[PDB]
């Protein structure tokens with residue numbers, strides 16, 4: 412099964428239609444697969460009826476299933492390229508998973524095929540020596556580490572402990588954080604990692620490790636949802652008071668804060684900022700297995716979601732209408748990637764084919780290099796189906812990374828039941844309404860400020876510790892010594908004595 416829609420230019424598409432033994436393909440991914448695949452189809456449908464976006468050129472599709480596996484994505488992604496090894500794939504919209512996009516980016520570069528991922532967030536994909544044909548509507552997770560460092564440097568939380576989940580996400584994220592911390596003069600009290608299958612009592616060890624240096628109340632979490640939950644419970648179980656500053660791993664999930672509400676309180680969490688797209692909800696909820704023949708996996712998905720069968724007769728009776736619709740996090744990015752391609756091709760067409768709306772000879776075939784370098788990257792448009800309020804834009808930096816805009820959430824105790832409130836955002840600079848954070852807003856006691864050392868006295872000079880540069884002991888100058896610097900005393904002589912003001 413492969414999805415093929417006839418068009419003048421054809422877009423390839425990659426979605427993890429199935430989850431990952433001899434089986435590359437398991438259950439239907441009803442949200443990251445079916446919902447996002449249907450969103451690309453939805454976008455094409457609209458582009459194809461839009462008179463300002465390629466009126467003459469009809470966009471086709473050749474959609475493939477990655478099966479949430481790089482190797483299965485590559486076998487499939489061969490379809491895209493054999494069209495040059497007689498209509499070709501003009502550009503690929505896809506890779507949900509980063510490993511999936513890296514695999515497909517390594518193949519498409521050899522055929523100058525532009526590619527826009529709508530979910531691959533690996534910092535690795537920003538390397539244009541490797542991925543020169545790759546852009547993404549979603550920004551790398553290394554941007555949320557920059558924002559985290561900006562939060563601590565604002566609250567002046569200089570001595571902080573850091574926790575990272577074992578993987579590409581945890582390791583690369585925390586590394587970018589430490590780098591942004593060092594340039595903002597923030598010291599890592601204790602670096603910590605959290606492996607895959609760590610036991611209930613194992614995660615409790617990590618809490619005692621962070622408490623070994625108890626002067627740092629701020630814990631910077633760059634963990635996966637699974638770890639951020641198990642660590643929060645091992646913090647509550649041992650009853651540990653921590654000022655969490657977490658990544659979108661934790662995000663604004665009611666799932667992460669389970670039973671450990673009081674322990675999670677005051678936590679600052681970052682979460683990639685999206686909105687539900689208009690019209691897709693009713694597009695999707697109106698899909699039925701009889702009329703949606705074009706999507707080969709729709710009948711497969713139907714039987715899954717409603718737990719019915721074609722032979723069992725009671726299958727058509729259901730509708731995606733009866734079940735309340737929850738629009739997948741990255742739907743917005745899918746549709747922006749499809750429009751970023753539709754626009755790039757449109758602008759290229761406006762430049763190469765000025766005497767016709769028809770696809771001219773200068774674009775038969777499309778030079779993918781000219782398409783990626785001169786049109787995909789230079790795209791700048793008002794995001795399609797954006798909320799009526801917003802003036803949300805679609806553009807890419809030099810490396811094709813999405814323009815990184817995130818939401819900041821604090822954990823609150825509503826008068827009782829515990830919730831998350833958006834306190835600020837990170838556009839290209841941190842912004843946050845401090846009156847919306849409870850441990851700041853009423854000036855109810857001093858800030859939770861985490862520092863290893865408090866400042867030295869008048870008669871004291873701060874002697875720094877050979878290790879960490881943010882730590883010092885308060886050593887006093889001899890009575891025959893005055894305070895020259897703030898880390899150095901000096902002899903007054905032989906007959907001379909220091910001034911009552913350490914001068």
Ligand SMILES: N[C@]1(C(=O)O)[C@@H]2[C@@H](C(=O)O)[C@@H]2[C@H](O)[C@H]1CSc1ccc(F)c(F)c1
Nearest residue numbers: 507508509530531532533580635636659660
């Ligand atoms: N951005 C992804 C990528 O593959 O780069 C892509 C997502 C998608 O298509 O929804 C898949 C993965 O979930 C994610 C891994 S990064 C990641 C971010 C937040 C976490 F909490 C976590 F644990 C890992």
Ligand SMILES: *[C@@H]1O[C@H](CO)[C@@H](O)[C@H](O)[C@H]1NC(C)=O
Nearest residue numbers: 564565566567568851858860
């Ligand atoms: C952080 O430190 C600066 C410089 O001492 C100070 O002006 C600022 O008010 C501090 N911010 C907070 C919120 O503590």
